[PDB]
Structure 1
């Protein structure tokens, strides 16, 4: 019904994987923006979104939410820049860091490299081996991790240590896990849209990483898409 907004995931939703958006797709969205407002959200940073969607990305969408909406543009103008250290405070930042440093120092492994802690605007990415390891070194860690459950245990330990502090944990891939404030997934971006009068907020993306929370969130009407051809097919069905 009513005034409405379409929000799209960027890679695989609007583009072919690792490819820039198509002229055909782009023309399609600008034609859609005639009747309904459009925005984009993704885990990547602004430079990445530009590569994928074009340098003029902010003139092309009514909202643009790099880094899950921790960076936000509305109507072409930079709305907010939020980061983990401002939300959590420095002392907590540093207590998390200090704990993870000392814990990693105690884990027995076949190899250790560097970038044990990667600091991002939205998360601490932590790797017992270190993110700089080579492919063969990562595979070795990953098989050890499967047998030993090194990441699961670190995360459990941390979850105990930092109970009450409003942090979520997330293991994936082969060598690291993420620590970030609660709700700092794609759901973050909804705070920027939910007071602009939309009667419906459509979300187009993957419904599954598990589960993408924005997809299942009570504010959105989530539609899972398999490719830009699909996004178009469903937009044709819903709109027009």
Structure 2
């Protein structure tokens, strides 16, 4: 076990998106854990991982990397911590926030709500409609956006305004744009693993194509990456690697 690590994205890879892991998947993972170390990484925060993977998540995985590894647990205890304001500084943080606030104020939408800017440890989540919107409101924006390309234009303008300042901008989900320091995608968690001496770090994700949130870690030479369709696919591949 100790020589290799199977590192899994959570949403769409270990669980159905935003849903609790199944008892079958949980049983499979602990059996797999007898043959390899296992870890989980995702953009969601620790409390969301607890809700989906169990309150005892840090005991069920050898590594737990909420927020792409900006928060990190090894063997049930916290590793070092970093956050966006500590890396970027308050001036750049405020420039980013001010630009996004002013930009959103000039977008004409059917509806606006609240939580246009969600401040997290490893990123800002920015939404023209507001992340507190209801499901009916979220789908309405999503369908409008696929026609008007509001988020695509926003991302392009952000890249122009902040070129060279060390930030990455990405379309996220149905209503948001993710703003984060370059390299603070899932690859960040590799910082906690690359010197541990594992013979192989396998990675499994469901969004490995360009623009997806597994793409960079999937293509990173430090991992042996696999694309999965759903948790059943993850099991099938893992059974082949660790019979």
TM-score grouping bracket, smaller chain normalisation:
0.7 to 0.9
Moved more, 40-49 or 100-109: 100-109
Deviation at 1:148, TM superposition (A): 4.3
CA contact (8 A) 1:186 1:214 kept: yes
Which deviations, in whole Å up to 9, do the C-alpha atoms of 1:1-24 show, x marking residues without a partner? 992111112233233445433444
CA contact (8 A) 1:207 1:215 kept: no
Whole-angstrom distance in 2 between the partners of 1:24 and 1:148? 42
Whole-angstrom distance in 2 between the partners of 1:192 and 1:162? 28
CA contact (8 A) 1:11 1:52 kept: no
CA contact (8 A) 1:10 1:42 kept: yes
Whole-angstrom distance in 1 between the partners of 2:217 and 2:14? 17
Whole-angstrom distance in 1 between the partners of 2:23 and 2:149? 46
Q: Gaps (5+ residues) in structure 2?
A: none
Number of aligned residue pairs? 240
Deviation at 1:74, TM superposition (A): 0.4
Distance 1:102 1:194, change over 3 A: same
Deviation at 1:66, TM superposition (A): 1.0
- For normalisation by structure 1, the TM-score amounts to 0.86
Q: Does residue 225 of structure 1 match 2:228? A: yes
Whole-angstrom distance in 2 between the partners of 1:103 and 1:16? 34
CA RMSD of aligned residues (A): 2.7
Which deviations, in whole Å up to 9, do the C-alpha atoms of 1:105-154 show, x marking residues without a partner? 33344443332222222222222333344455555555654554333333
Whole-angstrom distance in 2 between the partners of 1:143 and 1:20? 27
Moved more, 117-126 or 84-93: 117-126
Which deviations, in whole Å up to 9, do the C-alpha atoms of 1:156-185 show, x marking residues without a partner? 222122111111111244433221111221
Distance 1:16 1:153, change over 3 A: closer
Whole-angstrom distance in 2 between the partners of 1:129 and 1:156? 18
Distance 1:135 1:197, change over 3 A: closer
Secondary structure, aligned partner of 1:71: coil
CA contact (8 A) 1:206 1:212 kept: no
Whole-angstrom distance in 2 between the partners of 1:159 and 1:191? 26
- For normalisation by structure 2, the TM-score amounts to 0.85
Whole-angstrom distance in 1 between the partners of 2:230 and 2:133? 33
Secondary structure, aligned partner of 1:81: coil
Distance 1:129 1:201, change over 3 A: same
Q: Gaps (5+ residues) in structure 1?
A: none
Distance 1:110 1:53, change over 3 A: closer
Whole-angstrom distance in 2 between the partners of 1:5 and 1:26? 17
Deviation at 1:48, TM superposition (A): 1.7
CA contact (8 A) 1:215 1:223 kept: yes
Moved more, 56-65 or 129-138: 129-138
Distance 1:110 1:121, change over 3 A: same
Q: Determine which structure has more spread, i.e. the larger CA radius of gyration.
A: 1
Moved more, 64-73 or 99-108: 99-108
